[PDB]
Design a protein around this ligand. Structure first.
Ligand SMILES: *c1c(C=O)cccc1-c1ccc(S(N)(=O)=O)cc1
Ligand SMILES: NS(=O)(=O)c1ccc(-c2cccc(C=O)c2)cc1
Ligand SMILES: [Zn+2]
Length: 257
């Protein structure tokens, strides 16, 4: 089916997901000189103190760390958002080389990877309903640059050997996602979409200004994962990113000057 190869990648997706050519597609390039500071944007409220991680899964496109979203345990509020968004999972997109891998770009700069913390608007009851709504999701996006190691990422790196191939999962309880954040919560925000099929236009994107630093060894271990299932020819899971899409009739707002 769809993927990231030459024969099933982002240039092909529109044939089965025509919204790929829609009016609010993600990711986008963040032109920092064209984004407008909005002094009415509130601070983000990230409340992960009670987060309950469950499992890590290689789904053939990335790996997801999944959370208990049956109660308000780990929630995102504030910023541009109305209402409460529950954390359901996080995942990454990354490159084959340190100079590429992020989906969003900043003044056309690509980061080595991008973390997506996916939340859904609790007024819609469940995630499947939320993705059908224009304000159903809020994804907190965080850039990764290669430099010093991120201690809060190491527990994720440690377990990747056990989920090398598509369909493999492992217990991943008691993981604190607060260890994945930068110091500052300054952000850009704009209305967009899922960056993989079904490409639904349901996401308020909140992209942090400050990248996190991860070590070359940490991202190298990302690149040892496999797109393929066990017993199939090995295809390294690398370059699972969609390139920047036309901004069209949208304005990116900044919470900071
Ligand atoms: C995730 C699930 C299940 O966890 C189901 C359908 C779609 C997605 C999805 C979530 C987030 C994104 S992203 N790259 O954060 O925009 C793409 C697909
Ligand atoms: N969902 S999509 O991006 O439009 C898509 C789905 C399936 C294919 C496909 C199907 C069968 C064989 C091949 C081999 O290249 C590719 C190629 C593209
Ligand atoms: Zn993503």
């Amino acid at each position: 089916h769809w993927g990231y190869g030459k024969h099933n990648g982002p240039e092909h997706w529109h044939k089965d997901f025509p919204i790929a050519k829609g009016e609010r597609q993600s990711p986008v390039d963040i032109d920092t000189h064209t984004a407008k500071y909005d002094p009415s944007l509130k601070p983000l409220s990230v409340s992960y103190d009670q987060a309950t991680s469950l499992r890590i899964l290689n789904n053939g496109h990335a790996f997801n760390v999944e959370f208990d979203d049956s109660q308000d345990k780990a929630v995102l509020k504030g910023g541009p958002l109305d209402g409460t968004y529950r954390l359901i999972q996080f995942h990454f997109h990354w490159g084959s080389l340190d100079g590429q891998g992020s989906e969003h770009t900043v003044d056309k700069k690509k980061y080595a990877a991008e973390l997506h913390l996916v939340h859904w608007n609790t007024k819609y009851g469940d995630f499947g309903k939320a993705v059908q709504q224009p304000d159903g999701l809020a994804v907190l996006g965080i850039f990764l640059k290669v430099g010093s190691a991120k201690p809060g990422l190491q527990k994720v790196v440690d377990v990747l050997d056990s989920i090398k191939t598509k369909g493999k999962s492992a217990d991943f309880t008691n993981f604190d996602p607060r260890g994945l954040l930068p110091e500052s919560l300054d952000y850009w925000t704009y209305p967009g979409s899922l960056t993989t099929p079904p490409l639904l236009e349901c996401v308020t994107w909140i992209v942090l200004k400050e990248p996190i630093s991860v070590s070359s060894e940490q991202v190298l271990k990302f690149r040892k994962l496999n797109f393929n299932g066990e017993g199939e020819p090995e295809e390294l899971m690398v370059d699972n990113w969609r390139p920047a899409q036309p901004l069209k009739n949208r304005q990116i707002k900044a919470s900071f000057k």
